[PDB]
Design a protein around this ligand. Sequence first.
Ligand SMILES: O=C1C[C@@H](c2ccc(O)cc2)Oc2cc(O)cc(O)c21
Ligand SMILES: O=C1C[C@@H](c2ccc(O)cc2)Oc2cc(O)cc(O)c21
Lengths: 389, 389
Amino acid sequence: RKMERAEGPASVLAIGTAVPPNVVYQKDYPDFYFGVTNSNHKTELKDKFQRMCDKSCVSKRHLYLTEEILKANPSLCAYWEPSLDLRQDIVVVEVPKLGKQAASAAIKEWGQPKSKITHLIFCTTSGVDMPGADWALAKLLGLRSSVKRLVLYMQGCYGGGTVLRIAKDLAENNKGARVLVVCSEITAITFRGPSDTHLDSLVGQALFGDGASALIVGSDPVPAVERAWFELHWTGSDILPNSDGAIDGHLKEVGLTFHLMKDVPAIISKNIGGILKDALAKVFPAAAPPPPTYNDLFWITHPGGPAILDQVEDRLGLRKDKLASTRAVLDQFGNMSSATVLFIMDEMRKRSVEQQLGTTGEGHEWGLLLGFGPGLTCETVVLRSVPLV
Amino acid sequence: RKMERAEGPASVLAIGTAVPPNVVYQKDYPDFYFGVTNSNHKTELKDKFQRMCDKSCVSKRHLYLTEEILKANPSLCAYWEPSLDLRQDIVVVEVPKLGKQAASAAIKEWGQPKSKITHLIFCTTSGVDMPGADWALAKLLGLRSSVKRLVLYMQGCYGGGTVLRIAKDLAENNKGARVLVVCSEITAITFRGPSDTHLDSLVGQALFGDGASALIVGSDPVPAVERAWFELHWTGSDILPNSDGAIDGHLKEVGLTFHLMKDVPAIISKNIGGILKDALAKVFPAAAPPPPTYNDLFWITHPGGPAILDQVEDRLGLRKDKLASTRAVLDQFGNMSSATVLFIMDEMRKRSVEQQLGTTGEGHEWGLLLGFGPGLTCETVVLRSVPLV
Ligand SMILES: O=C1C[C@@H](c2ccc(O)cc2)Oc2cc(O)cc(O)c21
Ligand SMILES: O=C1C[C@@H](c2ccc(O)cc2)Oc2cc(O)cc(O)c21
């Protein structure tokens, strides 16, 4: 074995998050959005957007785009104007910058020198470039020039599951490997004025927020030195049936465009049960303990929108508190595409410590992280919490 | 271990390649390019381009873009016209299609049913979309809906090393995993008319060709059932010193643009020796056999251009036959970005079988695969050949 492998399960050793400082409260967003977009005359479209914000279960979002920046760049306040080069010029800089802040927080918590990072995974849905956001972050952080990089572009909302699926193999197959995992998303790539012709983009305007999350992932944490918070034990990916074109996203000259052509909440909720039952049967095979019930698992679920959570919770018969951590992040940050599930992982561990629960997963031993995105792709990670004190 | 790991080294079990059927001979390309681009009046620019083709060491290339397609879409025959949406509409379809052909050939050689593919890595520098080229290829091939996908967008010329670096961990860390690896590149994303202002893009017009390559990568090949051709033993990635902005590539509204701002051949050749000496010291540590000499290794080197190969060969003192397989692929296909090193791997194994050499690496046991691209990033894979008969 020319490259020695690790022994234990890939583990989350630290989590950091960062958001743009500018906050927009959802109560204010219909007026802010329709004002800066010169569309207050579209009165029926505006009250349809008000209705979507009222139901969004989003209280606030952090956004790079300010009224000042928008007014300085009127092609972003239009609906279908050529804009991509200006959007790129923003996000190729600011997506790695936001990721740097999250990464620096994770490194600080981890406590080891940054040169012990051996691998980097950078995931984003916001902009593309060569060299990529992985290179830029490595430069911003001053990582070793030999760090093994991977940039995951154009992933979308399942990408938080994807980066864990990859990081698990990198950490487990390389003795001593410490994988910096960063998801960073800035809505300047997709923001546009409203129209009555594509109401998909309206839903995105009510839900999408900005943010970055960063993990240190590694196997065999050094006792009394490093601290594990969650363990990755099983991963799965699925293309849901009858979902072709349920979520499309195209990088056009007018920027990134967002399309919903099927009932995404229905497709996810009708199929998720079979996926989870299958995944749990793999992790807990009869030959042996039976799998925990859904209510005895902890839940880190991508909140694509409230209707996905409501229908999943209804179809699976989840007790109402199971999705609390997930909905708290939706409430305070909106849908941050691939970064969102790592914000929920952070929220859950911090609540568990704060409330002196027995484990980092709200007192439960086993848990599920679920990403949903274009495909329709479902990423399933079965996690183990870590006992607290 | 909820997911059992493999034991042996990740191995290449099959290789397939595909190219567009339309061939352009380099002797004809100056006239073809300047004709279809309405630039024959630019007589001094044209003879500077003739000089670059004369020195390119490229005899022919396969190209999706025909004179017919170019004449039907005049924004591609311009130099700086908005074109991205039309380029995308081409390559989001044709890059996975070309990859399908290569994948089907690799699967056929492998000989197992396609549903035994458990993982897919799709690498391209040509277009981006959601769902991505990985999803489209999975659909085109009819792979299992639970295949674990990964799309590597905007990678560039080092990407053939990157996909091996990732595939090695996927194959080795998952018992029974069979990773379909596809690199597919179509120059419709970057083709543009010539100018006297950016001569970088001229070099690209003399060197870049189209093509896809596909591998099956897996650990523990089934004896007498599967056949290993090369083994992945060690990987490394490096950002070369003083190389910031040596190769940039931006996805703009005019399409993908290509920039060279430093002496790329000089940067690579002055630094490659230290990288190889380091990598070989890791694979063959003293504590023990000394590492093979450069002339006793087989060489799969990304041919970014003839000057890179000439200067690497000169600086390392390689015997003139070491880069023969590499230059044969450059000669017959040009620079196909990330796919090129897998074409060379295919050329080398087929020559070794054809000539009844003792191993799949021209009769040598150990070898080096090198990718170079934006960063300036150098990907190093140390390979082991497989003995023949
Ligand atoms: O179109 C977008 C925008 C993007 C996004 C969200 C938040 C952000 O801050 C930046 C970009 O997320 C997505 C996620 C998807 O699965 C599919 C998509 O089409 C998109
Ligand atoms: O700009 C391009 C074009 C691209 C390409 C080559 C062949 C092909 O068929 C399609 C695209 O390769 C590249 C590779 C790089 O490292 C950097 C780059 O900027 C580019």
